[PDB]
């Protein structure tokens, strides 16, 4: 068999600068006919992998000429002349000399200018309340870098239980991250308190971004 090894680790690449992704094969990918059977694929979240390069030197149809690959027969690199926002995702090397095998993939992350999150608070829907539930949602949208902290306050008092946080994958257009914070309570528990607040702490400011509503209002 042929094992394809890629480090899943790589440093975030500044937008518009060059990037290199390494791959090694346990046996040569060079065939006696002079062809190197090396493939590169890009996989975006929720999508199947997309072919970038076939047999090391060839671009798949419609693929930008910013992607090239070369190597020794056992050690290769995929070079991105200049990284663009749409390039984010997981890059895989693969070979078809001996059956088909893939590397473990390398996720490309982009470094861009720091951006404060746009914060929006949402009280429970009438439909959820009618069922006896009460989820309070806060979206912390289009920020950079990825690290962010959310703090919930019920009548001025911090609340940690029943909070669920979900981060999006890096945006393919502006290279930012977004996060959704959901505080789930019962309709009864929700109706026992008035003020609901979500505070976002990000490196763009020492002061948190505060979004609040009063259940009575």
């Amino acid at each position: 068999d042929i094992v394809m090894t890629q480090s899943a680790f790589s440093n975030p690449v500044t937008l518009g600068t060059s990037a290199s992704i390494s791959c090694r094969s346990s046996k040569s990918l060079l065939h006696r006919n002079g062809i190197t059977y090396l493939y590169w694929y890009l996989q975006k979240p929720g999508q199947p992998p997309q072919l970038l390069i076939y047999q090391m030197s060839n671009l798949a149809s419609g693929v930008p000429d910013r992607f090239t690959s070369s190597g020794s027969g056992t050690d290769f690199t995929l070079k991105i002349s200049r990284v663009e926002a749409e390039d984010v995702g997981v890059y895989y090397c693969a070979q078809n000399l001996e059956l088909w095998t893939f590397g473990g993939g390398t996720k490309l992350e982009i470094k861009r200018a720091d951006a404060a999150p746009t914060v929006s608070i949402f009280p429970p829907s009438s439909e959820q309340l009618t069922s006896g539930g009460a989820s309070v949602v806060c979206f912390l949208n289009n920020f950079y870098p990825k690290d962010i902290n959310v703090k919930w306050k019920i009548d001025g008092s911090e609340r940690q239980n029943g909070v669920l946080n979900s981060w999006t994958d890096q945006d393919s257009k502006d290279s930012t991250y977004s996060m959704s914070s959901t505080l789930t309570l019962t309709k009864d528990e929700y109706e026992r308190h008035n003020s609901y607040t979500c505070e976002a702490t990000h490196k763009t400011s020492t002061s948190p971004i505060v979004k609040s509503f009063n259940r009575n209002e």
Partner: protein
């Protein structure tokens, strides 16, 4: 040209599954049909291939017994049967032929009950842009597909990965448009949960009527 794969398969541990890959605008007749496995946040593993002319199969040694590849030229369908399912079999399975990839089937290995999602509109609280949301709560198994205005509304969308708690998933999505656009123009959350055959179109209504 498309290779059709069901979005989800929920099978109890120890049982067997037969995953289907149906050619739509493509005839499974000459090209090898490849199957690949993708575990959560990991690589891609080639399981094997089937020659649809003679039914000859080649497997990766680790899939020799676990996997069985078949093809039905009359039904235009390739199949991947997996035996005695374990938690390690839970993954996304892709079928590939002539360079065409199927959308993948999310295989869940669990004895938990299929549950349709509750779909909640998130209208803003009572500047130049406005953020709307959709909360998709209490479903099982994965996945859910969410679109806004049947996919016509694609810019300014954030769909947050689902989180599992007490046998049920919850996901959300935000959409940001110009303040002048909504509520003047309709904004609808379209949620599909293939495992339960649920399709819900939820319109975002302003919390307070436009008249006050």
């Amino acid at each position: 040209v498309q290779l059709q794969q069901s979005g989800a398969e929920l099978v109890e541990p120890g049982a067997s599954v037969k995953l289907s890959c149906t050619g739509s605008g493509f005839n499974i007749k000459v090209y090898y049909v490849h199957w690949l496995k993708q575990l959560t946040e990991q690589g891609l593993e080639w399981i094997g291939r089937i020659d649809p002319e003679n039914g000859e199969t080649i497997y990766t040694p680790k899939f020799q017994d676990k996997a069985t590849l078949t093809v039905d030229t009359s039904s235009n369908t390739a199949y991947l049967q997996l035996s005695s399912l374990t938690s390690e079999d839970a993954a996304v399975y892709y079928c590939v032929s002539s360079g065409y990839w199927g959308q993948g089937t999310t295989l869940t290995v669990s004895s938990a009950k299929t549950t349709a999602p509750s779909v909640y509109p998130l209208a803003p609280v009572c500047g130049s842009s406005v953020t709307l949301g959709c909360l998709v709560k209490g479903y099982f198994p994965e996945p859910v597909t969410l679109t806004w205005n049947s996919g016509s509304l694609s810019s300014g969308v954030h769909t947050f990965p689902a989180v599992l708690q007490s046998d049920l998933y919850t996901l959300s999505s935000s959409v940001t448009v110009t303040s002048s656009t909504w509520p003047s123009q309709s904004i609808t959350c379209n949620v599909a949960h293939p495992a339960s055959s649920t399709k819900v179109d939820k319109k975002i209504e302003p919390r307070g009527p436009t008249i006050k």
